[PDB]
Motif scaffolding. Sequence first.
Motif, PDB file in Angstrom:
ATOM      1  N   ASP A  64       0.818  -1.225   0.000  1.00  0.00           N
ATOM      2  CA  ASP A  64       0.000   0.000   0.000  1.00  0.00           C
ATOM      3  C   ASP A  64       0.854   1.279   0.000  1.00  0.00           C
ATOM      4  O   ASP A  64       1.689   1.481   0.882  1.00  0.00           O
ATOM      5  N   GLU A  66      -0.069   4.466   0.582  1.00  0.00           N
ATOM      6  CA  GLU A  66      -0.472   5.537   1.486  1.00  0.00           C
ATOM      7  C   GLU A  66      -1.251   5.051   2.700  1.00  0.00           C
ATOM      8  O   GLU A  66      -1.976   4.078   2.619  1.00  0.00           O
ATOM      9  N   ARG A 175      -6.559   4.889   5.440  1.00  0.00           N
ATOM     10  CA  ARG A 175      -6.761   3.463   5.169  1.00  0.00           C
ATOM     11  C   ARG A 175      -5.474   2.780   4.746  1.00  0.00           C
ATOM     12  O   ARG A 175      -4.904   3.113   3.720  1.00  0.00           O
ATOM     13  N   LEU A 176      -5.020   1.818   5.542  1.00  0.00           N
ATOM     14  CA  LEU A 176      -3.775   1.127   5.246  1.00  0.00           C
ATOM     15  C   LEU A 176      -3.907  -0.397   5.212  1.00  0.00           C
ATOM     16  O   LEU A 176      -4.154  -1.038   6.239  1.00  0.00           O
ATOM     17  N   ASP A 369      -9.027   2.223  -1.852  1.00  0.00           N
ATOM     18  CA  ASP A 369      -9.199   3.026  -0.642  1.00  0.00           C
ATOM     19  C   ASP A 369      -9.856   4.364  -0.980  1.00  0.00           C
ATOM     20  O   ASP A 369     -10.253   5.107  -0.084  1.00  0.00           O
ATOM     21  N   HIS A 381      -4.922  -3.658  -1.301  1.00  0.00           N
ATOM     22  CA  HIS A 381      -3.576  -3.703  -1.856  1.00  0.00           C
ATOM     23  C   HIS A 381      -2.789  -4.988  -1.678  1.00  0.00           C
ATOM     24  O   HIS A 381      -1.566  -4.951  -1.572  1.00  0.00           O
TER      25      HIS A 381
HETATM   26 CA   LIG Z   1      -4.079   3.190   1.421  1.00  0.00          CA
END
Ligand SMILES: [Ca+2]
Length: 391
Positions: A64, A66, A175-176, A369, A381
């Motif tokens: 991911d 971000e 969001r990760l 996301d 991701h």
């Molecule tokens: Ca993200």
Amino acid sequence: HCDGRGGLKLSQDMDTCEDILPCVPFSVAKSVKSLYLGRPVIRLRFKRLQPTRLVAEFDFRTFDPEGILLFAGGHQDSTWIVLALRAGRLELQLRYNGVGRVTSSGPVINHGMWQTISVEELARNLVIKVNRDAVMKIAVAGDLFQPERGLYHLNLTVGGIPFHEKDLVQPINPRLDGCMRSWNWLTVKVNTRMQCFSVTERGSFYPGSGFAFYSLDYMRSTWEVEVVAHIRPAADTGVLFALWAPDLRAVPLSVALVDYHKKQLVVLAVEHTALALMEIKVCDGQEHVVTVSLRDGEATLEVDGTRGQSEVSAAQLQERLAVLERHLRSPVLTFAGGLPDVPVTSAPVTAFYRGCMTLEVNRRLLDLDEAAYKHSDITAHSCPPVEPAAA
Ligand SMILES: [Ca+2]
């Protein structure tokens, strides 16, 4: 007509509906001692008597680009730090007595390999390390811990922040889809759903139970629709991409996998009419590139660089595309991996897609996301790998 949305498809001599079963299995192995940040996943409080400085270490893994890994400090208006990721690089945001700063270095972190990350507050500076190597050092004057009564307190959140993203030094989509393990502060609660895949690959995984949708405009030929989908299917039937016209209960355009012409195919359609068909080895466990491009007087479907044959005459193709134009003339919603409750005669396929998939629309990579809505079981991701045979 069977109910794809219900997990059924026409079988044999079209006399009955059959269950849509996976032809390719993906690994289900979970990492018991790990934490999935997807879906603050954890809030901690350290009541500490006697002055003390923050020290934290943990393993991290993600593809991911971000998101937010963690927060540490006090009230939004006091002093605190936030460790995040932007464009795949580690980013540290700080606020000391209301004053905010932000820095990020060259460590590319979203490569999918486990790595150790450490954060430590020294009376002089804040030091961030990746695999023991210092990558960031910022001078600071203040303390993350804060005196309350006769003790020193400090709050720490994981996978998000205690306040709103708009109050950060620099805005970011929190969001990760990432994983953590071997936490060492100065949270092992068995809930399978909170565990990460043991092994990860690139892409987005659709378990076959939901969709995600966006509001995208295709106007200005006066219109244009271009899609590139990299897929690794688990089943021979399912919707990959589709447009929905709410007030008309119609599906103006859709791209899906279908097992009957009985053949393993990819179909390109406008409403119920198939414009083109192209063969595909949907059950061999390989990755395939499906591309579609439509414009005034033109529609093309390709699978791994090879164009499929047209199913309509030149005259009716122009008729269909004309109707498509009218549809795109009004706001429509773009769906990934499935459709909402629509008439069964609205499109050739309505079942949910099952497998790994990446989508690019009008030359723009879709980040799940950023969807107006994404069914919670879809991993934005990462994808599990195809399960290897025993040998
Ligand atoms: Ca993200």
